[PDB]
Amino acid sequence: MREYKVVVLGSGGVGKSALTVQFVTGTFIEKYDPTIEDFYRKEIEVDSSPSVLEILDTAGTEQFASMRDLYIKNGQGFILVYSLVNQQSFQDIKPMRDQIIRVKRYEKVPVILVGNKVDLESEREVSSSEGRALAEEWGCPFMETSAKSKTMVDELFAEIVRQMNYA
Numbered sequence: 001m002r003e004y005k006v007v008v009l010g011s012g013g014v015g016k017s018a019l020t021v022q023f024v025t026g027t028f029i030e031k032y033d034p035t036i037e038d039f040y041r042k043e044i045e046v047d048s049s050p051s052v053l054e055i056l057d058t059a060g061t062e063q064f065a066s067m068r069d070l071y072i073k074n075g076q077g078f079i080l081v082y083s084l085v086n087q088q089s090f091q092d093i094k095p096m097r098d099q100i101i102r103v104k105r106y107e108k109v110p111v112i113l114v115g116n117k118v119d120l121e122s123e124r125e126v127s128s129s130e131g132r133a134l135a136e137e138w139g140c141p142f143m144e145t146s147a148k149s150k151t152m153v154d155e156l157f158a159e160i161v162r163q164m165n166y167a
């Protein structure tokens with residue numbers, strides 16, 4: 001069976017686990033449980049191709065950045081998450097693409113930039129077009145999601161598998 005290794009990266013609270021847990025189970029996690037490291041496996045049909053996604057839900061907690069170089073080496077596609085209601089989390093995501101490329105040593109790593117928490121449109125600190133621009137300087141897809149939408153999360157993970165197939 002083909003198998004894809006995806007690392008979900010970002011700062012604390014942005015919604016990494018709520019996005020991953022919505023893909024894997026169809027449920028929205030409301031109670032913030034800070035994450036050390038968690039692996040999930042889910043059989044995916046993208047373009048009608050049956051594969052496995054193995055998903056690495058990292059910690060955005062400052063200490064575990066020691067591990068990040070191992071995660072980047074052991075991983076094929078990367079979902080880079082910011083919360084659009086927190087512009088510091090948008091700022092924390094910009095060095096991370098280039099950190100991905102120092103370890104991988106080539107330019108075209110399959111990445112997607114995600115502005116999560118779009119359902120909280122009142123609280124928005126980061127505009128669509130700031131993210132949209134970052135994604136195009138980075139040459140990657142851009143999505144704004146709400147971990148509350150099964151449909152929005154599903155498209156995110158299906159597009160990471162499409163990205164790992166035209167890499």
Ligand SMILES: Nc1nc2c(ncn2[C@@H]2O[C@H](COP(=O)(O)OP(=O)(O)OP(=O)(O)O)[C@@H](O)[C@H]2O)c(=O)[nH]1
Nearest residue numbers: 012013014015016017018029030035060117146147
């Ligand atoms: N409104 C809204 N809340 C969200 C969304 N995604 C996550 N949350 C909430 O944000 C909080 C943090 O979400 P998590 O996904 O647990 O955070 P994380 O980014 O995995 O955090 P770390 O594990 O510390 O890296 C929780 O209370 C979630 O319920 C979203 O799309 N919309």
Ligand SMILES: [Mg+2]
Nearest residue numbers: 016017034035
């Ligand atoms: Mg988490």
